[PDB]
Design an enzyme around this catalytic site. Structure first.
Site, PDB file in Angstrom:
ATOM      1  N   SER A   1      -2.022  -4.048  -2.616  1.00  0.00           N
ATOM      2  CA  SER A   1      -1.087  -2.639  -2.441  1.00  0.00           C
ATOM      3  C   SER A   1      -1.999  -1.864  -2.831  1.00  0.00           C
ATOM      4  O   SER A   1      -2.300  -1.882  -3.871  1.00  0.00           O
ATOM      5  CB  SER A   1       0.333  -2.805  -2.650  1.00  0.00           C
ATOM      6  OG  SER A   1       1.187  -1.797  -2.149  1.00  0.00           O
TER       7      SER A   1
ATOM      8  N   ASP B   1      -1.915   1.130  -3.892  1.00  0.00           N
ATOM      9  CA  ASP B   1      -0.721   2.073  -5.731  1.00  0.00           C
ATOM     10  C   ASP B   1      -1.566   3.232  -5.501  1.00  0.00           C
ATOM     11  O   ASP B   1      -2.458   3.329  -7.196  1.00  0.00           O
ATOM     12  CB  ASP B   1      -0.368   1.560  -5.583  1.00  0.00           C
ATOM     13  CG  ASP B   1       0.676   0.581  -4.295  1.00  0.00           C
ATOM     14  OD1 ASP B   1       0.674   0.243  -3.415  1.00  0.00           O
ATOM     15  OD2 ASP B   1       1.710  -0.587  -5.173  1.00  0.00           O
TER      16      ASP B   1
ATOM     17  N   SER C   1       0.668  -1.290  -0.279  1.00  0.00           N
ATOM     18  CA  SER C   1       0.173  -0.208  -0.065  1.00  0.00           C
ATOM     19  C   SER C   1       1.174   1.544  -0.344  1.00  0.00           C
ATOM     20  O   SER C   1       2.275   0.956   1.027  1.00  0.00           O
ATOM     21  CB  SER C   1      -0.790  -0.173   1.142  1.00  0.00           C
ATOM     22  OG  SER C   1      -1.724   1.251   1.417  1.00  0.00           O
TER      23      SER C   1
END
Ligand SMILES: [Cl-]
Ligand SMILES: [Cl-]
Ligand SMILES: [Cl-]
Ligand SMILES: [Cl-]
Lengths: 353, 353, 354, 353
Positions: free
Chosen positions: C272, C274, C234
């Site tokens: 994650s 992003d 992340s």
């Protein structure tokens, strides 16, 4: 002819003098129509029922002087060329070409013949070029497998582009079908006043969609009413002189779908529905290197343009039907023009004349 | 010569048997190289430094048996053909063709020639077809204005597709430049084990990007070290046999940018960087009318594939440099092949190897 | 501290005076750090290792004077608030708030507290407001289920915002993990000259991603060299620039932040989140504007330096988030150790890069 | 009553038994209506005219058993929460919540109160959760600045969710305005047969858009016919179906919702937050699933009927939101009249309906 001459009122804004996309100063449209043969389908020979339509953002070199542009894909069962760079850079740098699905390759070849001749610096002292080509499938009436569109045809259409252009079954609309009636090229425009200034919104469409029953004219279910009448995708080009950024023009292109929906366009799985919109207000110089100023209306005031765009597309679609001529094509397939006498009968029936 | 040979380790997953995209059962690659002339540039004549590369998802009929596919545009200064339908239907129904920016039109024509030959129903008893064509600009070495690629070349490259294929300056990579060194075709593959099952991820790239000083090989600033060495966009094709939906393959395609960046790819304004990913796991029949069962890995377990994609892309880019040979072209321009000897001294100098 | 003071060179552009996102004149950053308790996790009580970080585009009223902006979702395993309108209108009209995944609702509440206070016409004589909130999951060290962030914390973070600001495990970075080392807030800036004009590109990141072995610092596989360092078991990128750019161009800039992420070992794994958000201070948009406006903007053909500078600022900003983070224990005695800087110098030297 | 029963026929597909989104078995809808005070607006005090509406994809744990989903933003002047993950993973893992613009933060807190209570592992042994919250601005009638919605109201709405739900000015639609008449919750459903199998498509809308004269009912310009009718002075569309579809396909269905919107006179003005969210109950995705799964999916070539049905459901639902609304006064003594039923039936007949 067109909606107004039949007492059919679409929208609340007034049209432009020509009530065509060319009402946007500088915009030009040319066609090349290809009709040949009759009878049984002879794959590769005919009957031929197709052509090419060219739309010029302005009278000059579109590559050296680009225009800000936007676009929206309602349904991607379409084979458009050049949209990726259009979205990335927010510009259009070539005339806009329309033709049948299997002639996009040929179209690109022809469009390039024209571009390279006007710019010998491309591929040597400067970059490449983004040809813009969109299409519709005219297979019901035309020998599409034959690829009868020639590269010279594309150059010809561009050189033929003028202020006044024919509508109906001409150019890219020659062998198109809509609502199981004869479809093709349709156009309309609207004028709107925003904070004192008057702007124009023009629309040219290549109609080739809908089941007979989907037809909706000014809210009237003409399609259903014409269920068993004999004879049994869409590109929307939007032009305006209002100053807008590329982001804003993507918003404008989406609104074209509003006019599409109101005529009975449901965007079935196989219907390539795409809208391209551009402004003639800001010209982007290819070689510019210094900070520039882009004239643009604040989003809070452009709602009128959004509505005028819907109105323009809706009537444009209707006009492609009112301007279309009955036609026979491959395998003796026939597409009759929307029966105007019966149409009037129906409109009066639903009290809307 | 590839990364392994020089003793350069990229990533942690082991490569496939051939360490080529073809490690994905059924995938085939074919090239057509066009080299001719030398000296000053003569538009429409030469020197000629270009070609065509074709990637076949499987050995059968692509239109009749489609494969799920995804795609991502890092920077849209590109002229790809067929992405709109790919995103809309999540499928690829034709072989994948790569060539130079100004030959996409010809590529389409050539691809249609092949497709129509294999499918007589298109345009008669069924719908049209979405040719998939991507490109890179080889103007530095090639007479791109001359459009020396011919439709026959496309058909030929397809008929040449095989498990084994050459890399470097061949096919579409013939006249390409990368990091101001000689660029072109590069390939690699990785094997990953997810819940007991082994899957393969292959990548083929057409490198044509970056400044000299950008080059990063396994983290080493090779470009800076060879800043004085003489000679002063990218398409990433991803293939896998792992079961994935169209949405997941859009994700996979994005991960290829991770590999691009690691070699020193910055996606400058004029760099057309695009990635296309497809799976051989699910075969989509064109004529299917019954509910089907699409096999797919849950998203919580596919991170290994995301990584393997970055690895294959990164090594593939480097391979294209390692496999390229020095070459001269239009106006006596020249692109030297990355000096492998000097590379080793530099790698070792930075603790690598 | 920062990579500079360690001799670690990233990119080719020179950093700004402070080498922080605030080198973009007018931009300000404020933090609120929440640390309390230790040991076993008592859901709803603690240990607490979270916080809030506020980024102000400029120093005036952000709602009445908006900035053009763009954004890119590399991997949407994230719960951001405010991106849909950012993309539609191309603007940012509120300070930017970062916090933990489960506190986004609280963040919105607090943010609105601030905004409605500063604008009494909202909801009465004019439209509503688009609060912008992004996040990362600090569950490894924080009692995230407890929602310890309070609405007042958001208002406080905004009023503490200024030029100078701490980096590392502070504010929203308080309980984050990166490469299995302590993560947090990192920042950096780069200067670029385009057609005889200087422009600054700043970056602030909230790092909370990566496997230990992925870590790549200036090309060196620092992650592998430190495989066995304790703590095993992340990301939001905020870009600011004073270069004139339209919304479309700012979306392009946002995408370039991923180049920097990838270069430090960021692969955007499945879970994650992003995301990159970019904005320019060059063109202020007045909420009530009605007349045709003139948007200053650089032609796309001359902005590649900004794309590179962006990737650079992000790459260093990520590393700085590690260099600035201090070891920390959390729920269930979980612990993440700060990247060993002297060890880092040794590794960089072994690879002839220092 | 609803349209279908009033004799107003929209579309050609028959409606489900309840003619509500809940005709898609397993889907439930709950409301919490907040009405208090009257007279002058006292910020933070009232009068209160707002609420919460919850839509449950199925009867069980939505987080542990997610449903595939898609979504489309026609015009982003909206503050939705949860769309980014929805698009990335193609799933919905919480009940859907609708309330006023400034109460989204409160809705998140409330929705999270429910979820965390039902899922003890979240934030401890597994990942986080993606709360799905959408909204409309009811400021014309409600003291929106006061944020009268409380987190408990959200949990409550969720628990009251039932197959039978009230429409009109209730829940999140309590204080909404449409076409300058009373707006609010509206719902409808259509049944379509595809390859010998019947599927249901339901829709629930929260109407809060359009100028008086935009109003279009079954093609009739009711808006213009009520131009001077007293009371002068965005929209979320939730689509459900039991047809098996992938995330990509559900994004397509979401888009079709705009067709129905446009046909009622929705133009997506600048400040109109128009968003569609579509999901299928056909496939449940296990949170902890780690093995290859099988997604049941209908081929795109046969889903056109679902596209039209979606259009019809939304179109009628918008109308039902008006027919079910009751006149209401609010802050600053503002008032919104419910569309005059008798006068409307009068106007319809005047246009052959
Ligand atoms: Cl722009
Ligand atoms: Cl799919
Ligand atoms: Cl903009
Ligand atoms: Cl999916």
């Amino acid at each position: 002819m067109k909606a107004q001459e039949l007492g059919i009122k679409i929208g609340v804004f007034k049209p432009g003098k020509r009530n065509k996309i060319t009402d946007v100063k500088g915009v030009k449209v040319g066609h090349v129509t290809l009709i040949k043969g009759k009878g049984k389908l002879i794959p590769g020979k005919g009957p031929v029922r197709t052509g090419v339509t060219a739309i010029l953002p302005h009278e000059g070199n579109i590559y050296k002087e680009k225009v800000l542009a936007g676009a929206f894909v309602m349904n991607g069962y379409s084979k458009p060329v050049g949209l990726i760079q259009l979205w990335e850079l927010g510009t259009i740098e070539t005339p806009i070409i329309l033709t049948n699905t299997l002639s996009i390759g040929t179209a690109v070849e022809g469009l390039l013949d024209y571009i390279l001749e006007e710019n010998e610096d491309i591929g040597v002292t400067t970059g490449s070029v983004n040809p813009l080509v969109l299409e519709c499938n005219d297979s019901y009436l035309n020998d599409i497998r034959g690829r009868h569109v020639k590269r010279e045809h594309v150059v010809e259409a561009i050189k033929r582009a003028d202020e006044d252009f024919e509508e109906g079954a001409v150019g890219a609309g020659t062998g198109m079908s809509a609502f199981e009636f004869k479809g093709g090229i349709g156009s309309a425009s609207r004028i709107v006043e925003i904070e004192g200034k008057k702007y124009t919104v023009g629309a040219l469409v290549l109609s080739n969609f809908g089941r007979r029953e989907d037809l909706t004219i000014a809210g009237v279910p003409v399609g259903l009413e014409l269920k068993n009448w004999p004879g049994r995708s869409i590109i929307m080009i939007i032009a305006t002189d209002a100053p807008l950024t590329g982001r804003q023009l993507n918003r404008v292109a989406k609104r074209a779908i509003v006019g599409l929906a109101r005529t009975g366009g449901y965007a079935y799985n196989g219907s390539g529905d795409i809208a391209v919109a551009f402004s003639t207000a800001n010209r982007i110089k290819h070689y510019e290197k210094e900070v520039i100023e882009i004239k643009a209306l604040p989003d809070s005031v452009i709602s009128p343009l959004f509505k005028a765009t819907a109105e323009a597309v809706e009537e444009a679609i209707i006009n492609s039907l009112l301007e279309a001529r009955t036609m026979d094509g491959r395998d003796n397939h026939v597409r009759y023009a929307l029966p105007k006498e019966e149409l009037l009968r129906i409109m009066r029936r639903y009290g809307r004349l």
